[PDB]
C-alpha cells in the first residue's frame, strides 16, 4: 500500500507527500510492475527536489527497470540537466547500458541535449560506445541533424581517428606522436579493428612493435572475433606472427566461426607461419563451422607441402 503511494507521489511531484511516506517506513527502493522505482519516476518527470530526497534516504541510484534503463538514462532522455548532475554526484553509472546497449550518451546525443552531452563526457562517458545496432552517439546525432553535438563528438574522436589512420597508412612518426599525446592505443574503428589490427593487416612491422611497446592489447577482437594473430596468418607476414606470439598472442584463439590462426596459415599456404604456431602449441585437432581441421584445408587449396608437416604432428 505504502509502495504505490510513494511511486505516485514521485510521478506527481508532491514533495511533502514523499517526505511523509518515507517517514512512515515506505520502502525507498519499491518497484512497480516494469521495474520503475520512485527515483526512476522523479527523474523522468523532472522533479529535482524529490530526486535529492530519495537518494538522501538510500535510494538505489543504478536500479534497472525491465528494459535496463537507470534513472540516469531517463534524465538524459528527457533533458533534465540538474538531475543528471545529481545522479552522477551520487555514484550513477555513466556508462551503464540497457538491453540493447544504449548508454546515457546515446540518448542525450539523439534528443539534442548539448549541455548533458558535455556533462556526461566530463564524467567519463565513452565517446565511441556502440549500441546493439552498431551506432555511436555521434551517429545518432548526425542522423538527427544535431549539428553542434556531432561536431563536438567528432572532435572528441579526432585524436583516436588520426592514430587509426596513421597505423593503417604506415606512418611511424605519427603513431609515436599520437600515442605521446594521449591516444587510446586500444581504440577501435567502425568494425572493431584496433591500430594493432590495422598494422598487422597492412604488414607494418615497425608500428606493430611500437604499439605493443605502449600497451596495446595483443588479443583484441574485432566484431567478428579476429585477433591480430588471425590477420597476420591470413596475410602471411611471418615477422609479425613472431612478434605477436612473443607478447602472448593466443595461438589457439577462435573467432565467431571457430577458425584459429592455424586454419588460415594452412588454407593460404604459409609454411613458415605453420611451424612457428606449432612451436607455440597450436592445436591441430580443432575444427570449425565446416568441421575441417587445418590438415583438410591444406589439401583443398592444393598445398600438400604444408599438409605433410601436419601429419607428423
- Do the Cβ atoms of 275 and 284 come closer than 8 Å? no
Residues in contact with 282: Cβ distance below 8 Å, sequence separation at least 6, in sequence order: 251, 252, 260, 261, 262, 274
- The C-alpha atoms of residue 195 and residue 178 are separated, in whole angstroms, by 12
Question: E-assigned strands of 80-159?
Answer: none
Among residues 287, 284, 289, 291, the alpha carbon closest in space to that of 307 is found at 284
Q: Which H/E stretch holds residue 245?
A: helix 238-246
- The C-alpha atoms of residue 204 and residue 187 are separated, in whole angstroms, by 18
Helices (H) and strands (E) in the chain, counts: 19, 0
Among residues 221, 158, 216, the alpha carbon closest in space to that of 185 is found at 216
Q: In angstroms, what is the resolution?
A: 2.3
- Distance of CA 292 to CAs 74, 176, 276, 279, 281, Å? 49, 42, 21, 21, 19
Residues in contact with 224: Cβ distance below 8 Å, sequence separation at least 6, in sequence order: 191, 192, 255, 256
Handedness of CA 242, 244, 249, 255 (dihedral sign): negative
Pure H helices in 170-224: 172-180, 195-202, 205-213
User: Cell triple for residue 206?
Assistant: 615497425
Q: CA-based Rg of the chain, rounded to a whole angstrom?
A: 26
Residues in contact with 278: Cβ distance below 8 Å, sequence separation at least 6, in sequence order: 262, 284, 309
3-state secondary structure of 147: helix
DSSP per-residue string spanning 119-146: HHHHTT--TT---TTS--HHHHHHHTT-
- Do the Cβ atoms of 76 and 116 come closer than 8 Å? yes
Amino acid at each position: 500500500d505504502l509502495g504505490k503511494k510513494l511511486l505516485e507521489a514521485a510521478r506527481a511531484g508532491q514533495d511533502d507527500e514523499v517526505r511523509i511516506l518515507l517517514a512512515n517506513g515506505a520502502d525507498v527502493n519499491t518497484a512497480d510492475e516494469t521495474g520503475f522505482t520512485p527515483l526512476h519516476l522523479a527523474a523522468w518527470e523532472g522533479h529535482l527536489g524529490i530526486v535529492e530526497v530519495l537518494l538522501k534516504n538510500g535510494a538505489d541510484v543504478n536500479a534497472n527497470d525491465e528494459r535496463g534503463h537507470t534513472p540516469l538514462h531517463l534524465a538524459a532522455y528527457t533533458g533534465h540537466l540538474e538531475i543528471v548532475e545529481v545522479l552522477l554526484k551520487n555514484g550513477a553509472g555513466v556508462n551503464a547500458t540497457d538491453v540493447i546497449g544504449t548508454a546515457p550518451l546515446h540518448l542525450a546525443a539523439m534528443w539534442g541535449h548539448l549541455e548533458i552531452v558535455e556533462v556526461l563526457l566530463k564524467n567519463g562517458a565513452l565517446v565511441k560506445a556502440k549500441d546493439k545496432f552498431g551506432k555511436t552517439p555521434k551517429d545518432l546525432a548526425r542522423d538527427n541533424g544535431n549539428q553542434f553535438i556531432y561536431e563536438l563528438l567528432e572532435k572528441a574522436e579526432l585524436l583516436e581517428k588520426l592514430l587509426l589512420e596513421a597505423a593503417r597508412e604506415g606512418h611511424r612518426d605519427r603513431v609515436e606522436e599520437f600515442i605521446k599525446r594521449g591516444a587510446d592505443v586500444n581504440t577501435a574503428d567502425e568494425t572493431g579493428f584496433t591500430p594493432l589490427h590495422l598494422a598487422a593487416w597492412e604488414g607494418h612491422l615497425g608500428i606493430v612493435e611500437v604499439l605493443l611497446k605502449n600497451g596495446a592489447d595483443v588479443n583484441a577482437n574485432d566484431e567478428r572475433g579476429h585477433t591480430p594473430l588471425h590477420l597476420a596468418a591470413y596475410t602471411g607476414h611471418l615477422e609479425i606472427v613472431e612478434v605477436l606470439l612473443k607478447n602472448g598472442a593466443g595461438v589457439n584463439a577462435t573467432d565467431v566461426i571457430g577458425t584459429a590462426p592455424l586454419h588460415l596459415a594452412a588454407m593460404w599456404g604459409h609454411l613458415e607461419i605453420v611451424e612457428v604456431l606449432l612451436k607455440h602449441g597450436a592445436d591441430v585437432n580443432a575444427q570449425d563451422k565446416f568441421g575441417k581441421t587445418p590438415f583438410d584445408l591444406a589439401i583443398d587449396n592444393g598445398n600438400e607441402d604444408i599438409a605433410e608437416v601436419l601429419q607428423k604432428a
